[PDB]
Design an enzyme around this catalytic site. Structure first.
Site, PDB file in Angstrom:
ATOM      1  N   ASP A  25       0.697  -1.229   0.000  1.00  0.00           N
ATOM      2  CA  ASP A  25       0.000   0.000   0.000  1.00  0.00           C
ATOM      3  C   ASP A  25       0.738   1.301   0.000  1.00  0.00           C
ATOM      4  O   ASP A  25       1.036   1.878   1.045  1.00  0.00           O
ATOM      5  CB  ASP A  25      -0.949  -0.050   1.250  1.00  0.00           C
ATOM      6  N   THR A  26       0.934   1.911  -1.163  1.00  0.00           N
ATOM      7  CA  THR A  26       1.547   3.206  -1.348  1.00  0.00           C
ATOM      8  C   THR A  26       0.608   4.302  -0.844  1.00  0.00           C
ATOM      9  O   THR A  26       1.012   5.494  -0.787  1.00  0.00           O
ATOM     10  CB  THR A  26       1.825   3.533  -2.831  1.00  0.00           C
ATOM     11  N   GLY A  27      -0.619   3.967  -0.463  1.00  0.00           N
ATOM     12  CA  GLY A  27      -1.516   4.999   0.066  1.00  0.00           C
ATOM     13  C   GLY A  27      -1.688   5.055   1.571  1.00  0.00           C
ATOM     14  O   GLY A  27      -2.564   5.788   2.079  1.00  0.00           O
TER      15      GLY A  27
END
Lengths: 99, 99
Positions: A25-27
């Site tokens: 998860d880059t978010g």
């Protein structure tokens, strides 16, 4: 490796000799794991997403192996359908987004 | 470009010739943009995250522009506190998580 996004970027990770599934998860600013027993004393923490904010618990200096890659840091424990690996760990294993 | 995760991977997008700011989120299945007015019929959807579910308006065959590249996809409009580019468009501009 090179993970494509046709499907969720799920990966197997290892924590406490355990293999579990996680989502890259880059978010996510922080790593959020499912309900579990981790060594130590936790502090309280608040995090927000779609539904809004929640208070989770936080542990420090937790070791997690991601695709045979060792990383050590803060992990948060709270309610989730999946463990989430956030930039605090992704930086360590050295992940970047390419396009 | 090759993006680092030292910082949030926020990018500039061009939607309805209005150029917003959004975060490349691989934790997201779909693209969800704060409230705005787009053309077409929308159908309600309900998306879940930390803190729960919000109801959004779904639009299809919507065109977005992420760092030059043109992508086509469904885009959900609603009460997000940050504009999110999800898997549905990330694949279109051929983004990959590498480590």
């Amino acid at each position: 490796p090179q993970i494509t996004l046709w499907q969720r970027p799920l990966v197997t990770i290892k924590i406490g000799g355990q293999l579990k599934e996680a989502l890259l998860d880059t978010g996510a600013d922080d790593t959020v794991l499912e309900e579990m027993n981790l060594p130590g004393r936790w502090k309280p923490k608040m995090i927000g997403g779609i539904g809004g904010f929640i208070k989770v618990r936080q542990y420090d200096q937790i070791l997690i192996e991601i695709c045979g890659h060792k990383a050590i840091g803060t992990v948060l424990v709270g309610p989730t359908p999946v463990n989430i690996i956030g930039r605090n760990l992704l930086t360590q294993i050295g992940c970047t987004l390419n396009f």
